Amino acid sequence: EKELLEEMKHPSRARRAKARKRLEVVRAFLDSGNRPEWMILEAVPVLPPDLRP
Amino acid sequence: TSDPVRQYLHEIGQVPLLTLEEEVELARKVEEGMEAIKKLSEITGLDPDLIREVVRAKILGSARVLDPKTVEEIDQKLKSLPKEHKRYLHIAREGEAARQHLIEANLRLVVSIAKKYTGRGLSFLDLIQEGNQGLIRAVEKFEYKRRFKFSTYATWWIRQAINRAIADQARTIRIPVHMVETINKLSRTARQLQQELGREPTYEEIAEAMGPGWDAKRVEETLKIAQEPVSLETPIGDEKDSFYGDFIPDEHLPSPVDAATQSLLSE
Amino acid sequence: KGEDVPEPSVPESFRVLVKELQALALDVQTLDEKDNPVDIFEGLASK
Amino acid sequence: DVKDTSLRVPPGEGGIVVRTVRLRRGDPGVELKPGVREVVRVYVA
Amino acid sequence: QLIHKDTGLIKEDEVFLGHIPLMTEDGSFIINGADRVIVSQIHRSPGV
DNA sequence: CATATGGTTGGGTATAATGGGATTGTCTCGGATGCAGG
DNA sequence: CCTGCATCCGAGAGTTAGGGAACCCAACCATATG
Ligand SMILES: [Mg+2]
């Protein structure tokens, strides 16, 4: 997040936009408390049988 | 990028084939490595499976993930034996490497065999993977001393693995292997009696043609148990709006009338 | 019985939706005014 | 030890029963599904 | 007929292949006891 | 609780075999993006 | 280095009704019956 905040001082507009877009995801993860590694599945949940009868 | 069949075919094609000399050498090294590993097990007194596993893990390297503590301790103990014994360990390493190289080089026979089993409830890649398992079995059990080519012994195991996988996994409701064979025999007999009779035979004909111990009721039960389930999402009508499961009522939960009757009865 | 109908509860389709969202590895929770969990399954799915 | 599973006239239908057909297992040319002993059809006008 | 390219022996056999539905006089079919009609299809002609 | 039967499951076959099978008549719109110029 | 400019890919496209392919051999737990 600190690297991206410093990246937001560049005169370029496209680079600044890219830094902002990356920061959206970084800050969402930081505020929500979700860990990024949870986006990779290790245990697959299994739906109850009565909903897949 | 996509189409994993192309990727797998390219990856197998990146390994060159083998000549008679290379094949015989690899078989000799695997056999002497197995003999050497059993000799090490006898010398050290440990279980042969465990020393096989530690030798294989040390060969495969850190890249491939019993924990590292036991493998290191037993390896170092194994690297402590006096001379005329550690030579066996070296032969075991070379034999394990030979086994890997042999499987890697003969993977293409698995694809060649498995390409003729499509359309039977298993995808192409699944058939190849089960053929690979059968190839591993054949490699492990192969005996070169008989001077026969490896593919002759490998084909039988590959076919056995593919057939067993088809019998085990092709059906939503699993039917045992002997019962699956019974169903296949029933189908073959009925097909031959259909061709011969110029019409679909009745159940008595099939029962007579199977042999003693078969009556029409048993044939009917066998065909009933051979029925596969249909999808609840089968589209009904041309428009994409009606599914089969939309026409099936729930018979488990009590209806409002039934619940009211029970409550009034309790009252 | 001649009385008026009582107040309704959570429909079963919302429970089905919650279960199908859990199968996609998404944690859906219903909360009260103080952000505490509210169990809409009556306790039948809690170990 | 048995219950009613009879065929009844649905709401809004009815009339005069004009024809009855019964097909049983083993009858020449009859091909029932496995497990189904017999089928009965009623034509009402 | 089964013809061996080498020997030259011939094995002639008549084999039953199944059933083909028959069109009635009015132009329909009886499939599973129900009357059915095959609808003609309009499509792009092959060519250049 | 004690077996005895069928049903179930694991193991085996030795001439030689060595890279698969389909693809097709919509239309617009908005964002992501690699390529060209200055 | 910036910018614009085709280029690619993905997501949309009204409601209600009615409709429907080997075979064999031997050991081993499970269940049935007394
Ligand atoms: Mg509809």
CB-CB contact of B157 with B137 (8 Å): yes
User: Separation of CA A20 and C1' G9 in angstroms?
Assistant: 24
Direct distance between the N- and C-terminal alpha carbons of chain A, in angstroms, rounded to an integer: 47
How many angstroms separate the alpha carbon of residue C17 from the centre of ligand 1?
Answer: 22
CA-to-CA distance for A53 and B245, rounded, in angstroms?
10
Q: Which nucleotide is nearest to B13 (CA to C1')?
A: F19
* The residue count for chain A: 53
Distance from C-alpha of A24 to C-alpha of B41, rounded to nearest angstrom: 60
The token pair that represents B5 in the structure block: 């069949």
SS3 D17: strand
Chains adjacent to A (≥3 CB pairs closer than 8 angstroms): C
**Interchain proximity C25–A48, CB inside 8 Å:** no
Residue B6's φ and ψ, nearest 5 degrees, are -65, -40
3+ Cβ–Cβ pairs closer than 8 Å linking C and E: no
Q: Select from D28, D29, D25, D18 the least CA-distant residue to D39.
A: D25
* Residue C37 parent element (H or E): strand C37-38
Asked if the C-beta of D34 comes within 8 angstroms of chain B's C-beta atoms, the answer is yes
Tell me the structure's resolution in angstroms, rounded to a single decimal: 2.7
With CB atoms and an 8 Å threshold, state whether B198 touches E16: yes
Strand F contacted by B145 CB (< 7 A): no
CA distance B78 to B75: 5
Is the distance from CB of B117 to CB of B161 less than 8 angstroms?
A: no
Distance between Cα B240 and ligand 1 center (Å):
8
Min distance B226 CA to chain D CA atoms (Å): 10
Cα separation, B214 vs A36, whole angstroms: 62
* Closest alpha carbon to B52 in B77, B76, B33: B33
**Chain B residue numbers touching D31 (CB-CB < 8 A):** 200
Q: Which of A41, A44, A51 sits opposite C19 (nearest CB)?
A: A51
Strands C30-31 vs B235-236: parallel, antiparallel or unpaired: unpaired
Tokens of B49: 């499976």
CA-based nearest distance C4→chain A, Å? 33
Contact assessment for residue D25 and residue D32, using Cβ atoms and an 8 Å cutoff: yes
Nearest CA among C16, C43, D4, D34 for reference residue B250: C16
Residue of E16, E20, E39 to mutate, interface with B, max B Cβ within 10 Å: E16
How far is it, in rounded angstroms, from Cα B153 to Cα B27?
Answer: 13
Q: CA of D35 to nearest chain B CA: how many angstroms apart?
A: 7
DSSP B175: -
* Chain B, nearest residue to D30 by Cα: B202
Distance from CA of E14 to the nearest CA of B (A): 10
Residues with beta carbon < 5 A to ion ligand 1?
A: B 241
Distance B171 CA to G11 C1' (A): 36
For chain B, the first-to-last Cα distance in angstroms comes to 69
Find all residues with CB under 8 Å of E22, minimum gap 6, and list them.
E29
For residues B204 and B227, give the distance between their C-alpha atoms in angstroms, rounded to a whole number: 20
For chain B, strand residue ranges (E) read 235-236, 242-243
What is the three-class DSSP state of E23? coil
Closest CA to D26 of B204, B218, B190: B204
| Nearest Cα residue to B89 out of B101, B77, B99 | B77
The protein residue nearest nucleotide F16, judged by CA to C1', is B152
Neighbours of chain C (3+ CB pairs under 8 A): A
User: Which residues of A are less than 8 Å from C21 in CB distance?
Assistant: none
Interface of A with C in 20-39 (CB under 8 A): none
Q: Do chains B and D touch (3 or more CB pairs under 8 A)?
A: yes
- In D, minimum Cα distance to B226 occurs at D34
